[PDB]
Amino acid sequence: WAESLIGLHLGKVALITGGSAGIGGQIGRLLALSGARVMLAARDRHKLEQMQAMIQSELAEVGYTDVEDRVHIAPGCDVSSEAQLADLVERTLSAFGTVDYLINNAGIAGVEEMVIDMPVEGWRHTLFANLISNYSLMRKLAPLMKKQGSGYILNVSSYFGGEKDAAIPYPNRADYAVSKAGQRAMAEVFARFLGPEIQINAIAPGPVEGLFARRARLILENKRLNELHAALIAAARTDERSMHELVELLLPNDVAALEQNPAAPTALRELARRFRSEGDPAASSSSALLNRSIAAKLLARLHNGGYVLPADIFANLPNPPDPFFTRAQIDREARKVRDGIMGMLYLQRMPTEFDVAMATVYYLADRNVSGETFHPSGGLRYERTPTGGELFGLPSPERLAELVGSTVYLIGEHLTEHLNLLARAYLERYGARQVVMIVETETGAETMRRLLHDHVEAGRLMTIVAGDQIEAAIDQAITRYGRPGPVVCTPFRPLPTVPLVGRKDSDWSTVLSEAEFAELCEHQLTHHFRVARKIALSDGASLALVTPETTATSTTEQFALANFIKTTLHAFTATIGVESERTAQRILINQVDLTRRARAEEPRDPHERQQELERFIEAVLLVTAPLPPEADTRYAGRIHRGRAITV
Amino acid sequence: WAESLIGLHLGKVALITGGSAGIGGQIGRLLALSGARVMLAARDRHKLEQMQAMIQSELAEVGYTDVEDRVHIAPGCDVSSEAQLADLVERTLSAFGTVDYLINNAGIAGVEEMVIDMPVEGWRHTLFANLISNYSLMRKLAPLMKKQGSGYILNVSSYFGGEKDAAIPYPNRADYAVSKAGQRAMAEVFARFLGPEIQINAIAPGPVEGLFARRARLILENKRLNELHAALIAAARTDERSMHELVELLLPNDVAALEQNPAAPTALRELARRFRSEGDPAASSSSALLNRSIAAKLLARLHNGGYVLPADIFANLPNPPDPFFTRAQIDREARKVRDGIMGMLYLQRMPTEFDVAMATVYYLADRNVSGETFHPSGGLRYERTPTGGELFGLPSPERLAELVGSTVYLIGEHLTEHLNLLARAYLERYGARQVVMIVETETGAETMRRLLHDHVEAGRLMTIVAGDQIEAAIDQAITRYGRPGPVVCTPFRPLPTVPLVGRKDSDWSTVLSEAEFAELCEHQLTHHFRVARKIALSDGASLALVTPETTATSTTEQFALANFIKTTLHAFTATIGVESERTAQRILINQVDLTRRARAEEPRDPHERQQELERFIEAVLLVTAPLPPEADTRYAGRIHRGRAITV
């Protein structure tokens, strides 16, 4: 079976991260059998030593000599740590000299929560492990590749990272999806810079063959949380009771008593009815509203949304008797998950790690591909959200009427003209009651206060300085000015103008640093994640995520980084749109792109510029004007969530 | 170099069409060296015999025996002929029994004209050779593959056939592009049906290494045609002279005299000035307007657009002295073409046919991919048009004002509700002067006349029966009711409901026939091509191409065929949009999709249905309301052409 493989990569040196198991271990194995010298990096020394032994034993069996010189390991390697990645590269270059192939395979599942349950530090950790690590190793190894005149960077992404012009929603996995999309986007935008000496591609395997009760149980506990949270948020909107008083109705922990209470809000009585109808009579979840675990995670959502409740509100919650969910409900949801994955597959057969690695090692022999995403497995039935539509007009007069009397939050700093035009559109054209302008710095606040002096003097434009504490700034806005209806989130920072690759004979000293690439992710991805999380938790009606602006005079490097961010953020927008849709959250989340693919598409004169700024206002109004609630059908609801439009 | 290849496909039988040369000859060669038995089909016997000899000689050299039994040829095989494809399959199955791999490689360049210069029979010929041939061979060979429990269909498409969710405009190549897109779309939609026994994928190589003066000269002759045609059409719109009288200004064939004529229309005097400024003083094209060849092709455009001119109008045109274009202008355009192709490549190196075939033969070993398009070469800088945006509202009141007093042409038959709602929107809401309803049959005409009785009785709705003569029907409309402003083109026919695959142990007697697949292309692709060609030639202001309707009750087979058509037509729309943009044609051409990917996205109740039909009217108005001509900037012009939106 190895006959077609032996000799294919003879003389090559490969670094494989995550090389102790999974597809990474198999790529390491087959590259070694193909004749490459390999460094396998991973955390667990013991698993790495076993993999190294098996590969060395197989090389000896097919007739390699000095097998200890052909397979090295780098144990205790956590790719989320920049220091550990520098140590990995020093260890690899000491062992083998210049790396030919960087196989950026290492990956973690990430937080595995909905965005509104996702710790900000957990999201950042996923980006460090899964995405920033891929740039960091490229930044250290590409200079040596360019100097020797050849190299290959392969980022191991996923089908769930999307594809060119299409995002793939991955609910409960936004951190992972964005990381996977960023791995592909890095190949798409760096290929022109790294050519002609270096190839950069991604692989995006689908599901591969590699507890299921415990996951099905978490799905059911998550559904109970979502149903309770959505009804409490909906009730609080139109009831005179505070959220504290609404949550008190839950404390007897009695479904039938909540359903039958004529003074309970309709959203809570209808929910109680659903718990009885859809419930298993042998499950305590059919007669009790929640348990302490769901209660704690619900209280965290409410607290994270600026709702005022005492920390001990659930201290005396009656404990429902086991089972909360029956083995029958848990097993039915587990079959639904499993059957869901198997029904994705056109070929009705799960690919093996071995088969994917084999297709990958054949693919690495191709010298005429860069910027591409290879699907070593595929044929998948799954939802996709096309991105990059440019032909739109205004929303309906019915949706625009819903802006009258509204509280608008605008977030930004660098895009002062956009922010001014938006504030004035919402206030002067569409009868918003007030705009809260949330900027990064006092200097930004003063720039906006001078641009909007008339509305400031009239009490219609309030300014808040967020710095690096956007969630506390939004809490200040909720407390002082009221919860937001429409929200527009622009980036505080412009894109950097440093080189993305170095001259062949240079040290690359000025080239985008590992720390600068992290900062890019912080300012252009994490910023929107933090706002989306906080705004959804705080019951905002709508949220436009706005990418950085490219113009006819942007540097080629700014175009590359802009498109990196635009592609990567599409994964976020698509995922959180579907997560929100499927959990009955009102909020509409969509993306408005100020980034284009090519300078030739940008406005060239003042007239075309005016056209562009009018399209920007139109685009933001198209995604932020709320749906009159009768129009939020299943059909219209899916259209107005998780989409991106290009100005 | 063959060491990794020998044994990879041992025991397989492959049919390769176009197997005498190019990538096809190399795939044939490398599959044989890999251990496959191959049938190579092509037209020229002599080239096939040479290829067969070289491959047989190389097999003998690497140690195969009985090499005459391993490489057969099928000369005189024209894949555009259904009879010849049946003969090919009989010949192949006699030689080898069941085919494992169908390599649908054969392809022609096609007409290589803009749509408005493309004979309808030439377009049909391209579809027969390049697309319908791929279904025809699959229809004959898949039953045997399914019966034996395994098979592979590979369609050799092109990067210029686009990708999932993105069309790639290929000006002067609409027939080729649509054929290439259809090859990919066939893999995308058939994979679920052909699984699990059969894999179907496409390959989409970019430019490959495989007169250039003569092509550069045709580019310059084509530019002169386009500039003259655009100015005559523009002038005729707002001058009281007939096109015949406008063309008389050209007969002295004197650039300076046309520029200096104070009574000549501004569009023609400005064009004459451009010919002098941009011209080579040593070229006769700088002092003469045209030559007999350009004159004949111009007269054909005008005649094909229903303009009345005598056939001999150019009989006495003075012949400009050679050179019309200097070697200097021809060589500069040839360098521009060449440099254009080389500047597409991130890797700055042209892939070889050998390298692409090698990557392809490795790819064929992967058993876990279906429905995919593999790029064996790639890393290309080129324009793309994302498709499948669903979030749009109405066009601007300024664009809607431009509908007042307009002549609207609606084409269709099956979608009677859509046609009624459109006629009534344009007439009752947007003050169109008249609607010409162009249907296929008398029964369709009578259905629409009864639905629109009020507007019929009032003289606002005229009905024409086109049958299979849509161009003559449009000529009747021009003559009797005046040239069209906005035009909406819906398909006459619904999608068929026959099976797309047969049961394993059946003869497949009821499965979509080769003739039925041709008819699908005729009704759902050629229909829109014929209308686009005729409407652009006839100076229509705008054209919406509308795909077939899928609903929550469409058969799974109708969803597959709908999506086939939607993807394939996107290639057409994107190509003709850019062709029109780049040749200064006014007309706006865009696509409105009534087809969705999945039944779950379709409306489920009467309310969602009303929402959907309102979105349809909005979408058609968004692409058909003309631009007030000051707004048709370079920037706004590219936005409003070649796009697709999904209702």
Give residue B352's identity as a one-letter amino acid code: T
Rounded to a whole number of angstroms, the distance from the CA of A365 to the nearest CA of chain B is 8
- Residue numbers after which chain B is interrupted (C to N above 2.5 A) read 210
Rounded to a whole number of angstroms, the distance from the CA of A394 to the nearest CA of chain B is 5
Bond before A351 cis per omega within 30 degrees? no
The chain A residue lying nearest B603, using CA atoms, is A635
Given the candidates 3.40.190.170, 1.10.287.3510, 3.40.50.720, 3.90.10.10, the CATH classification of the domain at B13-210+346-383 is: 3.40.50.720
Closest alpha carbon to B152 in B373, B367, B350: B367
Residue A368 and residue B378: Cβ atoms within 8 Å?
yes
The chain B residue lying nearest A591, using CA atoms, is B391
List binding-site positions of A for Mg(2+).
236, 239, 550, 580, 585, 602, 612
* A13-209+350-384 fold: Rossmann fold (3.40.50)
Query: For residues B492 and B520, is the Cβ–Cβ distance under 8 A?
Result: no
Query: For residues B416 and B439, is the Cβ–Cβ distance under 8 A?
Result: no
User: How far apart are the two ends of chain B, measured CA to CA in Å?
Assistant: 53
Strand partners, B435: B408, B461
Q: How far is CA B436 from the centre of its chain?
A: 27
**3-state SS assignment for residue A180:** helix
Rounded to a whole number of angstroms, the distance from the CA of B30 to the nearest CA of chain A is 13
Question: Is the Cβ of B377 closer than 8 Å to some Cβ of chain A?
Answer: yes
Question: Is the Cβ of A174 closer than 8 Å to some Cβ of chain B?
Answer: no
CB contact burial A107-138 (16+ within 10 A = b; e otherwise)? bbebbbbbbbbbeeeebbbbbbbbbbbbbbbb
B585 in a labelled binding site = yes
- Residues from chain B that touch A195, judged by Cβ atoms under 8 A, are 345-348, 379
Query: For residues B208 and B26, is the Cβ–Cβ distance under 8 A?
Result: no
Q: What distance in Å separates the CA atoms of residue B640 and residue B484, rounded to the nearest whole number?
A: 18
Give residue B167's identity as a one-letter amino acid code: A
Task: Please state at what angle helix A442-451 crosses helix A416-424, rounded to 10 degrees.
Answer: 50
Architecture of the A387-496+515-646 domain: 3-Layer(aba) Sandwich (3.40)
- Residues from chain B that touch A164, judged by Cβ atoms under 8 A, are 163-166, 384
Residue A639 and residue B196: Cβ atoms within 8 Å?
no
- Residues from chain A that touch B3, judged by Cβ atoms under 8 A, are 6-7
Q: What distance in Å separates the CA atoms of residue B585 and residue B577, rounded to the nearest whole number?
A: 10
- Nearest residue, CB atoms, A633 vs list B384, B607, B639: B607
| Beta strand spans in A416-502 (E) | 434-439, 461-465, 486-489
Q: What distance in Å separates the CA atoms of residue B211 and residue B217, rounded to the nearest whole number?
A: 10
- Domain B13-210+346-383 identical in fold to domain B386-646: yes
User: How far apart are the two ends of chain A, measured CA to CA in Å?
Assistant: 53
Residue A611 and residue B636: Cβ atoms within 8 Å?
yes
The chain B residue lying nearest A163, using CA atoms, is B164
3-state secondary structure B209-237: ECCHHHHHHHHHHHHHHHHHHHHHHHHHH
Q: What distance in Å separates the CA atoms of residue B87 and residue B71, rounded to the nearest whole number?
A: 18
Rounded to a whole number of angstroms, the distance from the CA of A278 to the nearest CA of chain B is 22
Q: What distance in Å separates the CA atoms of residue A442 and residue B542, rounded to the nearest whole number?
A: 51
Q: What is the DSSP string of B435-456?
A: EEEEESSHHHHHHHHHHTHHHH
Order of strands, edge to edge, in the sheet holding A101-104? Answer: A71-74, A37-41, A13-16, A101-104, A151-156, A198-203, A373-374
Rounded to a whole number of angstroms, the distance from the CA of A558 to the nearest CA of chain B is 17
Give residue B625's identity as a one-letter amino acid code: A
Q: What distance in Å separates the CA atoms of residue A496 and residue A515, rounded to the nearest whole number?
A: 12
Q: Which single residue is written with the structure tokens 């509700």?
A: B417
Query: For residues B592 and B546, is the Cβ–Cβ distance under 8 A?
Result: yes
- Residues from chain A that touch B631, judged by Cβ atoms under 8 A, are 611
* DSSP secondary structure letter of residue B62: H
List binding-site positions of A.
18, 20-21, 23, 43-44, 47, 78-79, 105, 176, 180, 208, 236, 239, 550, 580, 585, 602, 612
Closest alpha carbon to A358 in B322, B344, B369: B369
Please tell me the CATH superfamily of domain B386-646, with its number: NAD(P)-binding Rossmann-like Domain (3.40.50.720)
Contacts of B605 (CB under 8 A, 6+ apart): A633
Question: Is the Cβ of B315 closer than 8 Å to some Cβ of chain A?
Answer: no
A211 sits in which H/E element: none
Closest alpha carbon to A349 in A475, A206, A211, A529: A206
**3-state SS assignment for residue A329:** helix
- Nearest residue, CB atoms, A391 vs list B163, B590, B631: B590
Tokens of B573: 């729309």
Question: Is the Cβ of B162 closer than 8 Å to some Cβ of chain A?
Answer: no
Q: How far is CA B249 from the centre of its chain?
A: 36
Residue B393 and residue A395: Cβ atoms within 8 Å?
yes
Q: Which method was used?
A: X-ray
Closest alpha carbon to B273 in B297, B256, B293, B254: B256
Q: What distance in Å separates the CA atoms of residue B27 and residue B107, rounded to the nearest whole number?
A: 14
Closest alpha carbon to A441 in A466, A461, A419, A423: A466
Q: What distance in Å separates the CA atoms of residue B44 and residue B42, rounded to the nearest whole number?
A: 6
Closest alpha carbon to B304 in B503, B119, B44: B119
Residue B346 and residue A384: Cβ atoms within 8 Å?
no
Q: What distance in Å separates the CA atoms of residue A588 and residue A362, rounded to the nearest whole number?
A: 44
- Nearest residue, CB atoms, B346 vs list A349, A356, A371: A371
Query: For residues A277 and A297, is the Cβ–Cβ distance under 8 A?
Result: no
Closest alpha carbon to B153 in B208, B107, B92, B194: B194
- Nearest residue, CB atoms, B362 vs list A349, A365, A640: A365
Query: For residues A545 and A589, is the Cβ–Cβ distance under 8 A?
Result: yes
Q: What distance in Å separates the CA atoms of residue A544 and residue B305, rounded to the nearest whole number?
A: 46
**3-state SS assignment for residue A439:** strand
Tokens of B261: 């004529």
Q: What is the DSSP string of B320-331?
A: PPSPSS-HHHHH
Question: Is the Cβ of A598 closer than 8 Å to some Cβ of chain B?
Answer: yes
3-state secondary structure A72-141: EEECCCCCCCHHHHHHHHHHHHHHHCCCCEEEECCCCCCCCCCHHHCCHHHHHHHHHHHHHHHHHHHHHH
Range A453-458, long-range pairs (CB < 8 A, 24+ positions):
A455/A423, A455/A424, A455/A427
B25 sits in which H/E element: helix B22-33
Strands B385-386 and B166-167: antiparallel
Q: What distance in Å separates the CA atoms of residue B190 and residue B200, rounded to the nearest whole number?
A: 7
Q: What distance in Å separates the CA atoms of residue B23 and residue B360, rounded to the nearest whole number?
A: 9
Give residue B243's identity as a one-letter amino acid code: M
Strand partners, A155: A104, A202
Q: What is the DSSP string of B337-386?
A: HHHHHHTTBTTSSPPBHHHHHHHHHHHTT-SS--S-EE-SS--B----EE
Mutate to test the interface with A, among B391, B640, B641 (most CBs of A within 10 A): B391
Tell me phi and psi for residue A583, to 5 degrees.
-110, 15
Question: Is the Cβ of B642 closer than 8 Å to some Cβ of chain A?
Answer: no
Surface of B (4-63) touching A: CB under 8 A = 4-8
Report helix, strand and coil shares of chain A as percent, to nearest 5: 50, 10, 40
Bond before B323 cis per omega within 30 degrees? yes
Q: What distance in Å separates the CA atoms of residue B620 and residue B607, rounded to the nearest whole number?
A: 20
Strands A385-386 and A166-167: antiparallel
CA angle B252–B255–B256, rounded 5-degree value: 105
- Nearest residue, CB atoms, A163 vs list B164, B191, B380: B164
- Residues from chain A that touch B636, judged by Cβ atoms under 8 A, are 608, 611
Query: For residues A356 and A208, is the Cβ–Cβ distance under 8 A?
Result: yes
- How many other CB atoms are there within 10 angstroms of residue A497's CB atom? 10
Q: What distance in Å separates the CA atoms of residue A262 and residue A249, rounded to the nearest whole number?
A: 12
Tokens of B215: 């092509």
Closest alpha carbon to B597 in A581, A178, A336, A638: A638
Q: Which single residue is written with the structure tokens 């009905």?
A: B463
Q: What distance in Å separates the CA atoms of residue B456 and residue B303, rounded to the nearest whole number?
A: 31
Q: What distance in Å separates the CA atoms of residue A196 and residue B184, rounded to the nearest whole number?
A: 29
Q: Is the dihedral of CA A378, A384, A388, A389 positive or negative?
A: positive
Q: What distance in Å separates the CA atoms of residue B572 and residue B576, rounded to the nearest whole number?
A: 6
Count, residues in chain B = 647
Q: Where are the domains of chain A?
A: 13-209+350-384, 213-333, 387-496+515-646
Q: Distances from the Cα of B487 to the Cαs of A519, B446, B532, in angstroms? A: 51, 21, 10
Helices (H), B482-605: 514-521, 527-537, 556-582
Q: What distance in Å separates the CA atoms of residue A427 and residue A412, rounded to the nearest whole number?
A: 18
Count, residues in chain A = 647
Closest alpha carbon to A193 in A558, A514, A525, A601: A558
Q: What is the DSSP string of B140-176?
A: HHHHHHHHHT-EEEEEE--GGG-BTTEE---TT-HHH
Would you call B646 exposed, middle or buried from its count of C-beta atoms within 10 A (0-12, 13-18, 19+)? buried
Q: What distance in Å separates the CA atoms of residue B178 and residue B172, rounded to the nearest whole number?
A: 12
Q: What distance in Å separates the CA atoms of residue B126 and residue B132, rounded to the nearest whole number?
A: 9
Query: For residues B640 and B631, is the Cβ–Cβ distance under 8 A?
Result: no
Q: Which single residue is written with the structure tokens 């009711």?
A: B481
Query: What is the maximal distance between C-alpha atoms in chain A?
Result: 84
Helices (H), B207-317: 212-238, 243-248, 255-259, 266-278, 292-304
Question: Is the Cβ of A368 closer than 8 Å to some Cβ of chain B?
Answer: yes
- Residues from chain A that touch B384, judged by Cβ atoms under 8 A, are 164-165, 597
* DSSP secondary structure letter of residue B69: G
Tokens of B40: 């190579």
Q: How far is CA B466 from the centre of its chain?
A: 23
**3-state SS assignment for residue B49:** helix
* DSSP secondary structure letter of residue B494: P
Would you call B349 exposed, middle or buried from its count of C-beta atoms within 10 A (0-12, 13-18, 19+)? middle
Contacts of A625 (CB under 8 A, 6+ apart): A395, A396, A399, A400, A402, A403, A486, A542
Tell me phi and psi for residue B346, to 5 degrees.
-55, -35
Rounded to a whole number of angstroms, the distance from the CA of B577 to the nearest CA of chain A is 13
Strand partners, B543: B487, B589
Strand partners, A435: A408, A461
Tokens of A541: 């009606």
Closest alpha carbon to A105 in A128, A70, A139, A129: A129
